[PDB]
Design a protein around this ligand. Structure first.
Ligand SMILES: CCc1ccccc1-c1ccc(CNCCc2nc3ccccc3[nH]2)cc1C(F)(F)F
Ligand SMILES: CCc1ccccc1-c1ccc(CNCCc2nc3ccccc3[nH]2)cc1C(F)(F)F
Ligand SMILES: CCc1ccccc1-c1ccc(CNCCc2nc3ccccc3[nH]2)cc1C(F)(F)F
Length: 327
């Protein structure tokens, strides 16, 4: 069968934690008062949530209310546990309260209010410096959550809120996040299609924090090449075909051989044979101001088939791409 794998960093963080910390079922529910909140306007949605701007009437403070649909509602204890473990961490969204509607019994998570610059404004105005600055802010969040034994598993632009006026960023929607345990086989039906790592697409279950580094690379390729999404698959099989048309089929086969991964028997018919593409093929007059040899070297070090070969979040912060960022 497949060859085992473990994270190269933060391998044993969750073993130092006591037992029964893991048994969260009818444990520390602690519901707040829903009547403290008045919904003001809809901000947007998650896949299984509706998000509102609200007012806390006991103190007139602006907050964010995330109403959970049944799919997200079922995993609420894990999202609560993860949000509480990471609270106060760099660029992590702050959970402020947990409430339930007594009429529908639907639960909601209440957060610190964070400004969210409109996506159209961000897409046209972020400079080469802005991209380096915000990517460095996301790495601070990923290194922190990875150091705490947690993988986000849904890194994408929609899960990144930017208050551009105050140069502030938050990594949000920890609903798919999970605790990393060495040797554990995880569900591959995580992240969003366009941001799924090759490990997920080839059904390699023993993945780790490195999956977040792949998704971050997809996000970066989209920002510097102004091509959203960068890898635009029609389904999960085609998603791997989109990646192979850029990274090539030779390194993909070296990857599946290294881990002894068995693919669907029709693999050759959809994957074909493709050379590695030069990054310069994606460069044109409208995005050339966002591309540098450092950017491409960084992208190259994130977007690798082999999850063990990708930069960790801490190594990524050391890359020359970030030398012009004020630290
Ligand atoms: C391809 C993305 C992109 C390319 C080039 C420049 C900027 C962006 C971008 C554009 C928008 C955003 C902001 N994302 C937050 C969206 C959002 N609003 C929410 C409201 C409610 C719930 C979730 C929410 N998520 C972040 C980004 C980001 F993070 F910089 F990539
Ligand atoms: C249905 C939305 C919901 C979904 C999931 C969890 C909680 C709620 C909820 C449930 C109740 C309230 C507070 N409702 C107060 C409404 C109200 N204001 C009044 C002012 C004067 C007189 C009567 C009034 N009734 C706030 C909320 C809130 F803000 F969404 F959290
Ligand atoms: C142990 C079963 C087995 C024995 C012999 C040959 C193949 C497999 C196999 C092995 C794995 C899977 C699961 N799906 C593979 C994932 C995948 N992603 C692809 C993307 C593109 C092309 C093929 C792809 N296959 C399905 C299968 C299946 F369906 F049984 F064939």
């Amino acid at each position: 069968g497949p060859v085992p794998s473990r994270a190269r960093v933060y391998t044993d963080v969750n073993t130092h934690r006591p037992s029964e910390y893991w048994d969260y079922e009818s444990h520390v529910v602690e519901w707040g008062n829903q009547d403290d909140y008045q919904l003001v306007r809809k901000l947007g949605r998650g896949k299984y949530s509706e998000v509102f701007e609200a007012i806390n009437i006991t103190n007139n403070e602006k907050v964010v209310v995330k109403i959970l649909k049944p799919v997200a509602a079922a995993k609420i204890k894990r999202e609560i546990k993860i949000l509480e473990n990471l609270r106060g961490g760099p660029n992590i969204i702050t959970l402020a309260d947990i409430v339930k509607d007594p009429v529908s019994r639907t639960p909601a998570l209440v957060f610190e209010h964070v400004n969210n610059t409109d996506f159209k404004q961000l897409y046209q105005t972020l400079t080469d410096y802005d991209i380096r600055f915000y990517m460095y802010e996301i790495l601070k969040a990923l290194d922190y959550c990875h150091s705490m034994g947690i993988m986000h598993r849904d890194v994408k632009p929609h899960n990144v809120m930017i208050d551009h006026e105050h140069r502030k960023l938050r990594l949000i929607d920890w609903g798919l996040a999970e605790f990393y345990h060495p040797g554990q086989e995880y569900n591959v039906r995580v992240a969003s299609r366009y941001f799924k790592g090759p490990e997920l697409l080839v059904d390699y279950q023993m993945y780790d924090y490195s999956l977040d580094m792949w998704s971050l690379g997809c996000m970066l390729a989209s920002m510097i090449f102004r091509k959203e999404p960068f890898f635009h698959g029609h389904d999960n099989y085609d998603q791997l075909v989109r990646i192979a048309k850029v990274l090539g089929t030779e390194d993909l086969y070296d990857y599946i051989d290294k881990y002894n991964i068995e693919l669907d028997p029709r693999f050759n018919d959809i994957l074909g044979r493709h050379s590695r593409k030069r990054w310069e093929r994606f460069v044109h007059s409208e995005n050339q101001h966002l591309v540098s040899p450092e950017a491409l070297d960084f992208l190259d070090k994130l977007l690798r088939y082999d999850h063990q070969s990708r930069l960790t979040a801490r190594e990524a912060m050391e890359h020359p791409y970030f030398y012009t960022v004020v630290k």
